[PDB]
Ligand binder design. Sequence first.
Ligand SMILES: NS(=O)(=O)c1ccc(C(=O)NCc2ccc(F)cc2F)cc1
Ligand SMILES: NS(=O)(=O)c1ccc(C(=O)NCc2ccc(F)cc2F)cc1
Ligand SMILES: [Hg+2]
Length: 258
Amino acid sequence: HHWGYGKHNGPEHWHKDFPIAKGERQSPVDIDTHTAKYDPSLKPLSVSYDQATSLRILNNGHAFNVEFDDSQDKAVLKGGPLDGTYRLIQFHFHWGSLDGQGSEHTVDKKKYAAELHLVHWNTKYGDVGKAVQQPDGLAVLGIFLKVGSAKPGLQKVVDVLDSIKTKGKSADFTNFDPRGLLPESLDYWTYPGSLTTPPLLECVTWIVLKEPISVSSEQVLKFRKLNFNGEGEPEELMVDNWRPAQPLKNRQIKASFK
Ligand SMILES: NS(=O)(=O)c1ccc(C(=O)NCc2ccc(F)cc2F)cc1
Ligand SMILES: NS(=O)(=O)c1ccc(C(=O)NCc2ccc(F)cc2F)cc1
Ligand SMILES: [Hg+2]
């Protein structure tokens, strides 16, 4: 049936319905800090989220997305390895059943507790639908989460999870400021890749931040209480919604710092 993260429909099965799963620029990948190339020509990232308008939060099976109004250049990402303006359309997380796993990308084989993905699309393409059909259509800002101190800016998200426990549920989520989820430093690694969930389109420029943000054990626990299933169906906890690292193949990971 539909794809998932279970034994019978997990990542190892996606290739049957989405041949691109065994493509040349699939994500996530393991970032080997010792072979990543420091690139002096990489420009600093420009994150302008001051005018961000969040609208809704929803459980879509797989994960929970916080959507933003992308009708105008309100929250945009520019700079770095990007050409043009990219609008923030939504952000979501991937997490594990235990603190030692959850992130999609790994650094020197180290998995973090979770990973935040802030998804943006290239404005030159007019709409996200056209953007996903281009090699530079999307830019996803990836941030690692490690268990430690609580992240104040994340609490508003944690408190609302109860109202969207099952698949298909959504709740109004206005006035959320995504700037509250950023680490202090904007140093990053970048490589061309793909969406990490079906349809696995190879249209993403990945920008993974070096500095993880810290979240408390209690905050991460609440992600784990969400459900993959819809209301009235057998309860399957939403945990381990991450795809294992894919072969790097003929790609080079560039670093904005030495
Ligand atoms: N402007 S808004 O807040 O209402 C909005 C928010 C989220 C999404 C979404 O997650 N769709 C994903 C999505 C839909 C179609 C497609 F081809 C690729 C793709 F990533 C769409 C619109
Ligand atoms: N974990 S991750 O950052 O890589 C990621 C980011 C966005 C999406 C998404 O928008 N899915 C909907 C969607 C629906 C239809 C389509 F054609 C493409 C598409 F991405 C999926 C995975
Ligand atoms: Hg593409």
